[PDB]
Write a protein that binds this ligand. Structure first.
Ligand SMILES: O=C(O)CNC(=O)C(=O)O
Ligand SMILES: [Mg+2]
Ligand code: NI
Ligand SMILES: [Zn+2]
Length: 331
């Protein structure tokens, strides 16, 4: 069995190996990469996403979100308070202001210590889930707006044509902006490209151990768990590495830098934080191996998680028994 300890693997494809996305994903899996839940892919030195980032300041962040924490330093939830629209140029200046800027630090480990010690005491502002792309249309390899759609994958594997579309999203971050513990919708893959700026630290639990995380989360968030059998789908719960180690949960950590891709694998729980002002682009995707995970994915039917149009068909075709309950939660 490849990668039996479930370590995060890092890949350095050549330009020729970067031509066929599906083939390279399947290659990474042949080496055991999925067992970690997360892999890093460093593009060939010949490749670029676009020419420059000099012309992005006029992108609008229609609904910036202030991430307000409740709890204790290592175990907290966050809610998202809506703020007035601002441009990416305005958001960059905010991120670099004395109130929000990254503090002085020694290295990535010291910054991680500071994050876990102090996150709860501040409320950073996050631009999330903005439909769009920063890949040049003439970038032909690993262009996250030109991938095969998940609807076409389900049709190729199972024969059923379905409605829906699959497009990328932009994320504008600052110091302390946080992504809560979650798997992807319908336990899909994701791919994330860090276009510019400061790093992103990731934490991940191996798919084979995901239920261990879920059991800890039910213990640590007992009211949320009573509310919804799939409450991690609400994307609000944070648990620190120290707390995970105290409870014997298997996990790994890695820091993504500008110019690097990360891939999350089906049913790989992940969480993390941004080091400072940055811009990432991400999209969900599928492969033949995902279908069996999609059929088994939990679902939120309580009303909180509220998702994309395109999840309807995936539930309808892969989970017909759950469809009626799930849909009542969406209305
Ligand atoms: O960059 C982010 O906002 C965090 N992204 C993801 O959870 C992802 O790509 O799965
Ligand atoms: Mg612009
Ligand atoms: Ni994710
Ligand atoms: Zn729910």
């Amino acid at each position: 069995a490849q990668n039996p300890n479930c370590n995060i693997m890092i890949f350095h494809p050549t330009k020729e190996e970067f031509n066929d996305f599906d083939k390279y994903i399947a290659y990474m899996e042949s080496q055991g990469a999925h067992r970690a839940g997360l892999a890093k892919i460093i593009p060939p030195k010949e490749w670029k996403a676009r020419e420059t980032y000099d012309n992005i300041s006029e992108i609008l962040i229609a609904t910036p979100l202030q991430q307000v924490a409740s709890g204790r330093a290592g175990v907290f939830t966050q809610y998202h308070k809506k703020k007035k629209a601002m441009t990416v140029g305005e958001y960059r200046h905010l991120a670099n202001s004395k109130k929000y800027q990254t503090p002085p630090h020694q290295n990535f480990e010291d910054l991680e210590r500071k994050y876990w010690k102090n996150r709860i005491y501040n409320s950073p502002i996050y631009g999330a889930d903005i439909s769009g792309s920063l890949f040049d249309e003439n970038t032909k390899q690993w262009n996250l707006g030109h991938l095969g759609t998940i609807q076409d994958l389900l049709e190729k594997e199972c024969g059923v044509v379905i409605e829906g579309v699959n497009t990328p999203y932009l994320y504008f971050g600052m110091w302390k902006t946080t992504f809560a513990w979650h798997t992807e919708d319908m336990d899909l893959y994701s791919i994330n490209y860090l276009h510019l700026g400061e790093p992103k630290t990731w934490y991940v639990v191996p798919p084979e151990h995901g239920q261990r995380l879920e059991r800890l989360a039910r213990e640590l968030f007992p009211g949320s768990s009573r509310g919804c059998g799939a409450f991690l789908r609400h994307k609000v719960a944070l648990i620190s590495p120290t707390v995970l180690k105290e409870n014997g949960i298997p996990f790994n950590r890695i820091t993504q830098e500008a110019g690097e891709f990360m891939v999350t694998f089906p049913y790989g729980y992940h969480a993390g934080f941004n080091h400072g002002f940055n811009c990432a682009e991400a999209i969900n995707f599928a492969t033949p191996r995902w279908i069996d995970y999609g059929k088994m994915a939990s679902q939120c039917s309580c009303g909180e998680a509220r998702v994309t149009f395109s999840m309807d068909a995936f539930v309808r075709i892969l989970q017909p028994e759950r469809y009626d309950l799930w849909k009542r939660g969406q209305d």
